[PDB]
Design a protein around this ligand. Structure first.
Ligand code: IV6
Length: 164
């Protein structure tokens, strides 16, 4: 069912996360962590204190799809065991130093063709698939986008609700 999902998305904030490669999204799904550039890191740390749930919606560049979405469970932290991100051209490990812990809510894909009816008021009402890494998605758009994903019956949201 979708009822626990809707409870988790209640009054959530949503952010578009863009990844240059599939490898880091697979690593994020395996290890429950994410790292972003400092400008987005600051925005996510602020949002984490501000909302019952901060939702990251992932899209690998040029994939034509979203790869899933996750809830922040921590602010960023430094000093953990090195996350072996695959660094794109021009990107260094220091730029990706802050590490957020995340809990996956859906690890299934959604193709962009399925979200073409959703526009983001915070990005000039462009289709929600359009946006830079870190673009905030307004509540109603974000909620409907997350509800479009296929159910991920391997995840039990009971623990996530208790983190709230
Ligand atoms: C582990 N965290 C991350 N891993 C990867 Cl592979 N890419 C990330 C990222 N955080 C932001 N980006 C990003 C988004 C859009 C364009 C580019 C680019 O360099 O062209 C890079």
């Amino acid at each position: 069912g979708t009822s626990k999902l809707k409870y988790v998305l209640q009054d959530a904030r949503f952010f578009l996360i863009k990844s240059n490669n599939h490898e880091n999204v697979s690593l994020a799904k395996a290890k429950g962590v994410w790292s972003t550039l400092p400008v987005n890191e600051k925005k996510l740390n602020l949002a984490f204190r501000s909302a019952r749930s901060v939702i990251l919606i992932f899209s690998v560049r040029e994939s034509g799809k979203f790869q899933g979405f996750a809830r922040l469970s921590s602010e960023s932290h430094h000093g953990g065991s090195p996350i072996h991100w695959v660094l794109p051209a021009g990107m260094s490990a220091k730029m990706l130093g802050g590490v957020f812990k995340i809990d996956w809510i859906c690890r299934r894909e959604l193709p962009f063709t399925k979200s073409a009816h959703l526009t983001n008021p915070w990005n000039e009402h462009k289709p929600v698939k359009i946006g830079r890494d870190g673009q905030e998605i307004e509540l109603e758009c974000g909620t409907q986008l997350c509800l479009l994903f296929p159910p991920d019956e391997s995840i039990d949201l009971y623990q996530v609700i208790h983190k709230m």
